[PDB]
């Protein structure tokens, strides 16, 4: 359910923050916080800024 794609590179400066490159596809887990969303990027889990992604329709 619901996938998002990275618009820009994101290098975390804090703990629990999911690092990623532009073009990466992330599976959404939680979006309770309007700014800090939690998702899965392969074998890494963590939070990322919601303004760094947009929906990935997937076929």
């Amino acid at each position: 359910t619901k996938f998002v794609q990275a618009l820009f590179d994101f290098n975390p400066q804090e703990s629990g923050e999911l690092a990623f490159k532009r073009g990466d596809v992330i599976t959404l887990i939680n979006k309770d916080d309007p700014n800090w969303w939690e998702g899965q990027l392969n074998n890494r889990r963590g939070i990322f800024p919601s303004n760094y992604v947009c929906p990935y329709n997937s076929n």
Binding site: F8, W36, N51
Partner: peptide, 8 residues
């Protein structure tokens, strides 16, 4: 890249 929002 826009500024990242503050952590909790």
């Amino acid at each position: 890249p826009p500024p990242v929002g503050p952590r909790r």
